[PDB]
Design an enzyme around this catalytic site. Structure first.
Site, PDB file in Angstrom:
ATOM      1  N   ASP A   1       0.823  -1.201   0.000  1.00 31.38           N
ATOM      2  CA  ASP A   1       0.000   0.000   0.000  1.00 31.38           C
ATOM      3  C   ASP A   1       0.860   1.254   0.000  1.00 31.38           C
ATOM      4  O   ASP A   1       1.262   1.752   1.059  1.00 31.38           O
ATOM      5  CB  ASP A   1      -0.898  -0.059   1.235  1.00 31.38           C
ATOM      6  CG  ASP A   1      -1.928   1.048   1.284  1.00 31.38           C
ATOM      7  OD1 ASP A   1      -1.871   2.012   0.490  1.00 31.38           O
ATOM      8  OD2 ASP A   1      -2.808   0.913   2.139  1.00 31.38           O
ATOM      9  N   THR A   2       1.130   1.768  -1.194  1.00 24.58           N
ATOM     10  CA  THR A   2       1.991   2.942  -1.337  1.00 24.58           C
ATOM     11  C   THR A   2       1.363   4.220  -0.762  1.00 24.58           C
ATOM     12  O   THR A   2       2.077   5.165  -0.430  1.00 24.58           O
ATOM     13  CB  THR A   2       2.414   3.142  -2.811  1.00 24.58           C
ATOM     14  OG1 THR A   2       1.252   3.329  -3.628  1.00 24.58           O
ATOM     15  CG2 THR A   2       3.221   1.917  -3.320  1.00 24.58           C
ATOM     16  N   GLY A   3       0.038   4.244  -0.620  1.00 31.70           N
ATOM     17  CA  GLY A   3      -0.659   5.363   0.014  1.00 31.70           C
ATOM     18  C   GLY A   3      -0.658   5.348   1.536  1.00 31.70           C
ATOM     19  O   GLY A   3      -1.202   6.264   2.164  1.00 31.70           O
TER      20      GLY A   3
HETATM   21  C1  LIG Z   1      -6.665   1.280   3.800  1.00 31.54           C
HETATM   22  C2  LIG Z   1      -6.631   0.820   2.343  1.00 31.54           C
HETATM   23  C3  LIG Z   1      -7.027  -0.657   2.239  1.00 31.54           C
HETATM   24  C4  LIG Z   1      -7.515   1.676   1.435  1.00 31.54           C
HETATM   25  N1  LIG Z   1      -7.130   3.104   1.554  1.00 31.54           N
HETATM   26  C5  LIG Z   1      -5.990   3.498   0.704  1.00 31.54           C
HETATM   27  C6  LIG Z   1      -4.798   3.776   1.619  1.00 31.54           C
HETATM   28  O1  LIG Z   1      -3.578   3.839   0.870  1.00 31.54           O
HETATM   29  C7  LIG Z   1      -4.972   5.059   2.449  1.00 31.54           C
HETATM   30  C8  LIG Z   1      -4.830   6.351   1.646  1.00 31.54           C
HETATM   31  C9  LIG Z   1      -4.938   7.549   2.564  1.00 31.54           C
HETATM   32  C10 LIG Z   1      -3.823   8.348   2.769  1.00 31.54           C
HETATM   33  C11 LIG Z   1      -3.890   9.452   3.613  1.00 31.54           C
HETATM   34  C12 LIG Z   1      -5.076   9.746   4.275  1.00 31.54           C
HETATM   35  C13 LIG Z   1      -6.195   8.947   4.075  1.00 31.54           C
HETATM   36  C14 LIG Z   1      -6.128   7.842   3.227  1.00 31.54           C
HETATM   37  N2  LIG Z   1      -3.877   5.021   3.406  1.00 31.54           N
HETATM   38  C15 LIG Z   1      -4.038   4.891   4.721  1.00 31.54           C
HETATM   39  O2  LIG Z   1      -5.088   4.741   5.328  1.00 31.54           O
HETATM   40  O3  LIG Z   1      -2.811   4.845   5.455  1.00 31.54           O
HETATM   41  C16 LIG Z   1      -2.886   4.968   6.865  1.00 31.54           C
HETATM   42  C17 LIG Z   1      -1.739   4.090   7.324  1.00 31.54           C
HETATM   43  O4  LIG Z   1      -0.604   4.941   7.144  1.00 31.54           O
HETATM   44  C18 LIG Z   1      -0.972   6.301   7.360  1.00 31.54           C
HETATM   45  O5  LIG Z   1      -0.446   7.163   6.350  1.00 31.54           O
HETATM   46  C19 LIG Z   1      -1.506   7.706   5.550  1.00 31.54           C
HETATM   47  C20 LIG Z   1      -2.778   7.535   6.363  1.00 31.54           C
HETATM   48  C21 LIG Z   1      -2.490   6.367   7.299  1.00 31.54           C
HETATM   49  S1  LIG Z   1      -8.395   4.125   1.455  1.00 31.54           S
HETATM   50  O6  LIG Z   1      -7.872   5.498   1.337  1.00 31.54           O
HETATM   51  O7  LIG Z   1      -9.137   3.954   2.716  1.00 31.54           O
HETATM   52  C22 LIG Z   1      -9.328   3.825   0.181  1.00 31.54           C
HETATM   53  C23 LIG Z   1     -10.420   2.972   0.295  1.00 31.54           C
HETATM   54  C24 LIG Z   1     -11.222   2.712  -0.813  1.00 31.54           C
HETATM   55  C25 LIG Z   1     -10.933   3.307  -2.037  1.00 31.54           C
HETATM   56  N3  LIG Z   1     -11.718   3.045  -3.111  1.00 31.54           N
HETATM   57  C26 LIG Z   1      -9.843   4.163  -2.162  1.00 31.54           C
HETATM   58  C27 LIG Z   1      -9.044   4.417  -1.050  1.00 31.54           C
END
Ligand SMILES: CC(C)CN(C[C@@H](O)[C@H](Cc1ccccc1)NC(=O)O[C@H]1CO[C@H]2OCC[C@H]21)S(=O)(=O)c1ccc(N)cc1
Lengths: 99, 99
Positions: free
Chosen positions: B25-27
């Protein structure tokens, strides 16, 4: 190009007269954009992750340019804290993970 | 390997002799795992995702083998929709985005 993950993989995208910064996100099935008043028909949806669900508006066949690569597909719009380029468009621009 | 994104980038991880499936998960800044037991001290922390904030248990210096590549780093345990490998460990295994 190659994007390392030392920092958030933020890139410039174009959706109409809006250049925005967005995350190239392999963890996202679909593309989620911060609130913006896009033209056209939409469908209501809820998307969920860490913390729970948010309400979004789903638009189909929206052209988006990602780092000078053309894409066209479904985007959802709502109160996300970050613009997220999900797999539905990452595949279109030929993006892979490599290690 | 090279991983395309037409499907979710789920891989097998080894953490404490236990095999789990986790999403590359690059996000995600951080690595977040579903409720599980891990040994040693932990710290209570909070993290925010797309839907709001959750409480997690933070464990430092935890070894995980991700798709055959070794990492040792911070893992947080809490109510996530799926096990996610974030950039803190993706960087350790030499993972980049390429297009
Ligand atoms: C949790 C994943 C299975 C899915 N998520 C993508 C994810 O990359 C989010 C993307 C993301 C990024 C920033 C803020 C909210 C969401 N990252 C995230 O929640 O990371 C958390 C863990 O590390 C921390 O750093 C960033 C937030 C924390 S998601 O944003 O909830 C998501 C869910 C469904 C869709 N269609 C698109 C995106």
């Amino acid at each position: 190009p190659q994007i390392t993950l030392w920092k958030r993989p933020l890139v410039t995208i174009r959706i109409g007269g809006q250049l925005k910064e967005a995350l190239l996100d392999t963890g996202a099935d679909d593309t989620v954009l911060e609130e913006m008043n896009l033209p056209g028909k939409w469908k209501p949806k809820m998307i969920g992750g860490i913390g729970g669900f948010i309400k979004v508006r789903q638009y189909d066949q929206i052209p988006i340019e990602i780092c000078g690569h053309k894409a066209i597909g479904t985007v959802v719009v709502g109160p996300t804290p970050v613009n997220i380029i999900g797999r539905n468009l990452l595949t279109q621009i030929g993006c892979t993970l490599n290690f």
